[PDB]
Amino acid sequence: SVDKTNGEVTLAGGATSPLTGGLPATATEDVKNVQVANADLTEAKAALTAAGVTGTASVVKMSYTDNNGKTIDGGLAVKVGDDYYSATQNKDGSISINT
C-alpha cells in the first residue's frame, strides 16, 4: 500500500500473509519512487497554471488538412479550449509542453 502523501510504503492493507506468486507479469519492472500517470499530465498542468492559463490538461493528436483533403498529422497538443499548446511526449510517456 503506497501512501503518496510523503512516499511511505506499508504492507498492503495490513494483510499479514505472503502471497503465492503475487507479482504479476505487468509489474515485473523495478521502481525507486512512487509514480504518477502520464495521462495525469502533471507537467503540462503545472506549466499552464504557472503561465496563468486554466490548464486542466486534455491532450489530443493533431491533424491538418488543406483544400486538397490531403492530410498530415502532428504530435500531441494540449487542447486548452481551442487554444492548442504544442506538446511532446518523452520516451517514458510523460508529456511536456514545448517551450
Binding site: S63, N67, N68, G69, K70, T71, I72, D73
Partner: protein
C-alpha cells in the same frame, strides 16, 4: 507490353480517390514471371492520382504509372508493363473498397 487505363475520369490532384477513413491502403501486384507480390503502403495524403503515380514510379519496381489529360480539366491514369506475356499482371487493393471497385 501490356498497359491499362482507368475507365473513369477526374479533374484535380485534390481528388480524394480513396476513403479518408482507411488508415493506410495497400496495393498488391502479381505476375506469372513475378517472384513475389509488390506492396504499396501510404499515409493519409496519398488519395490522389499524382500520389499513386509517385508511389508506383518511385518504387522502382519495373512498373510505372503515367497521367493523361483527356480534355481540358480532365485526367486519366495509365499503367506500364515491360513487354512479354510473362509480365502480365493481376492487381488487388487490400484497403479501400472504393479503390477496389476502381482498379480491380
Amino acid at each position: 507490353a501490356q498497359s491499362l487505363a482507368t475507365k473513369t475520369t477526374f479533374a484535380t490532384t485534390k481528388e480524394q480517390l480513396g476513403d479518408t477513413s482507411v488508415t493506410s491502403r495497400t496495393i498488391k501486384i502479381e505476375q506469372p514471371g513475378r517472384k513475389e507480390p509488390l506492396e504499396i503502403k501510404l499515409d493519409k495524403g496519398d488519395t490522389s492520382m499524382e500520389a499513386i503515380r509517385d508511389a508506383i514510379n518511385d518504387a522502382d519496381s519495373g512498373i510505372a504509372a503515367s497521367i493523361v489529360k483527356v480534355k481540358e480539366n480532365e485526367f486519366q491514369l495509365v499503367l506500364t508493363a515491360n513487354s512479354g506475356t510473362d509480365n502480365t499482371m493481376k492487381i488487388t487493393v487490400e484497403g479501400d473498397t472504393k479503390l477496389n471497385d476502381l482498379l480491380a
